[PDB]
Design a protein around this ligand. Structure first.
Ligand SMILES: Cc1n[nH]c2ccc(NS(=O)(=O)CCCCF)cc12
Ligand SMILES: Cc1n[nH]c2ccc(NS(=O)(=O)CCCCF)cc12
Ligand code: NA
Ligand code: NA
Lengths: 414, 414
């Protein structure tokens, strides 16, 4: 039976990471801000909140907006997520030394929650006003939700596959999972993978808050996102995009790249329970964690750290607590980064994967913000108060998205 | 080195197929219509063609509309592709004997070109008219492009993974590719896979026809789609959805299921050349065919049949002819089903996979319609005039979608 530990799968390592965040456009500055207890969630000064009088008035816009890095050409040639993907794709490649890889062994897997939706309603109005010939010949390549991954593959020259998984909150983690599969199956030796997502706007807020899924603690924005806390209220939006560079260890050593961590395995299961709510028993979500251990060659005892999905909805954290217990990783140190960075849907799984890698690299877990009164039903060892320095050897990043999509990524210290 | 032929991968077989089509809502009636030279492409009697005076006035609506099978509940609870997915999901399961499988070994992989887009502009207007509280709590689960696969997994009880690949015209084939991967890697023993796509409307027509990509031969609708013909004019829309049931051969024999064909391998590459146009040399597209042979254990000589992508654009068919030659399958008998069924984007790769399976089962290839004057630059053995009965043992289905996404599925007679 093949596994990473017994050589059945080639060793895959992470060699570069990049992310834009409500705390910082630089991933290393975001890391240091998280360690200092910073939060990216503030009061929304956007005019659409006062216009429609939204139930939620809090959220985290990117510290550095994507369009401040975009000229007129990009503003009409690409959708938002494509523009975010081009920005992150370029920053990731330079951060990795701008290597020259074999294009036929180079893949791209970038997930997203929805895609270039704003370009559909724009083309809707552009033809209602002037007719069918007033729709741009570039409209198809902007609207298609594979567009972000397509521009990244074209910009970097990836010819071993350009793929876009879609599974809401797990899209970014699932992208890293499939990129790992594309490598261990022999189709590629190096891959850019992650997730991108659109900005906070009025319609996304209205749709999610009508599910009673979002926190409404508008008086203290930095204290609204309270994963595993008894005063839970729901999740808070926090914009993000994130990409990582993974490659076989053989490929990394031959180019002189210093690996940040090891990508050991990936488990994908599904609940088949409800269209938006997770299964309370957490059985299938836990099986995804178990499956990532099986492919990696680990046991629950080896898991020192779990980067939780932790959206801070009442039923979400309760289900994940059961899932962690079902997987047998209840003794692990748990971090819920959505306490500080919020929820970025199609990108957050990729962002939290980057944070998992940094935790294994520096041997430190940032504190879960606003964890002050532990929920009696959730008995987990969550890091809080200050960063916890520890000897973390293996970690699992969880992402359980709407629709019942469970992705677990098993990571190891290099 | 693992392969299907040398036992490195478990044997995977196709046990049931279902499709709705511009010719028939029944896949067996569609097959018989194709063999009799029927076409689903007619003059569009929709009022939006006269309203905007579209350059194209031809296309193939479904013979049996999806919403004629939908009550009021489904018309507000689901988007179009979700409704198509529920219809096809239910028909496929009954056609397979309604088996009772282990939910933890059952996966669903359903691709789509875009998703529930019509529900975004609907929620856009619903809040402009009444405010944020007038957006349905079901809006999120209708809009998310993973929605069709989500309702199919929930309806049939698939708990080993519910996934949605997005890659334009190759989405439906890529879904079958990932479902094959999910099985040969040990994560599942049975999978429902295919693709769904929305109907023909004015905006899709305007966007694609402004790329000069669509045929404008409105006087003879049944003769507009002319793949590999010298009088090529572009592609024609033809609505479709298709699903197939695949499972390990061990799993099929233990339940008494008669396999229709074997799914032997799948190759995914990318061009990284242009956002909508395929590479002229067809090198990466041919490598996807080669890769499916490598995983299957075949050589170009074993390929008797190629179900071509064949959109009938001038540059598309020229690039695929080079791709087939690059892969070394130039002596194979080529079928271009878009000549009769048109192009259904996210679903067509799944539909043409079903047609490939039926070709191997019945030993017959339908004629490529409107192939009357062979393009001098495309020297391929395309089936034309009447069905060609032959001893086809192995076939490859091609799907090269916009964005440079190349998927090749290698199929074998059971
Ligand atoms: C707005 C918008 N314009 N274009 C988009 C494309 C995708 C999404 N996705 S989203 O979930 O609604 C945003 C929530 C993430 C908050 F950090 C939104 C938009
Ligand atoms: C319209 C519509 N409403 N909802 C949709 C969801 C997806 C798509 N896809 S499409 O490419 O534009 C249709 C082209 C296929 C022709 F057979 C269209 C719609
Ligand atoms: Na996590
Ligand atoms: Na084909």
């Amino acid at each position: 039976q093949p596994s990473t530990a017994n050589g059945g799968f080639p060793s895959v390592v992470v060699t570069a990471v990049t992310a834009t965040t409500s705390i910082s456009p630089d991933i290393e500055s975001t890391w240091k801000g998280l360690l200092a207890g910073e939060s990216g969630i503030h009061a929304l000064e956007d005019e659409f909140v006062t216009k429609w009088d939204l139930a939620v008035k809090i959220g985290g816009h990117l510290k550095d907006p994507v369009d401040s890095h975009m000229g007129r050409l990009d503003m009409r040639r690409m959708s938002y997520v494509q523009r975010m993907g081009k920005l992150l794709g370029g920053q990731l490649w330079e951060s990795a030394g701008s290597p020259e890889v074999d294009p036929d062994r180079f893949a791209v897997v970038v997930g997203t929650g929805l895609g270039g939706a704003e370009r559909i309603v724009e083309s809707y109005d552009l033809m209602n006003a002037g007719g069918p010939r007033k729709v741009s010949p570039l409209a198809v390549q902007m609207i298609m939700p594979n567009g972000a991954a397509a521009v990244i593959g074209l910009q970097l020259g990836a010819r071993a596959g350009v793929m876009t998984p879609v599974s809401a909150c797990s899209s970014g983690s699932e992208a890293i999972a499939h990129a790992w599969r594309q490598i261990v199956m022999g189709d590629a030796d190096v891959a850019v993978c992650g997730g991108v997502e659109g900005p906070i706007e009025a319609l996304p807020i209205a749709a999610f808050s009508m599910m009673r899924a979002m926190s409404t603690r508008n008086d203290e924005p930095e204290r609204a996102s309270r994963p595993f806390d008894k005063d839970r209220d729901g999740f808070v939006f926090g914009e993000a995009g994130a990409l990582m560079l993974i490659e076989t260890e053989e490929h990394a050593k031959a180019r002189g790249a210093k690996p940040l961590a090891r990508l050991l395995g990936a488990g994908i299961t599904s609940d088949a329970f409800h269209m938006v709510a997770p299964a309370a028993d957490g059985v299938r979500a836990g099986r995804a964690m178990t499956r990532s251990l099986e492919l990696a060659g680990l046991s629950p005892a080896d898991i020192d750290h779990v980067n939780a999905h932790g959206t801070a909805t009442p039923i979400g954290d309760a289900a994940e607590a059961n899932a962690i217990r079902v997987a047998g990783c209840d003794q692990a140190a748990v971090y819920a980064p959505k306490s500080a960075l919020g929820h970025s849907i199609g990108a957050v799984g990729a962002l939290e994967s980057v944070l998992t890698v940094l935790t294994l690299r520096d041997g430190v877990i940032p504190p879960t913000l606003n964890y002050e009164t532990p929920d009696p039903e959730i008995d987990l060892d969550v890091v809080a108060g200050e960063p916890r320095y520890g000897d973390y050897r293996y970690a699992v990043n969880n992402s359980f998205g709407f629709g019942g999509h469970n992705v677990a990524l098993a990571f190891g210290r290099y």
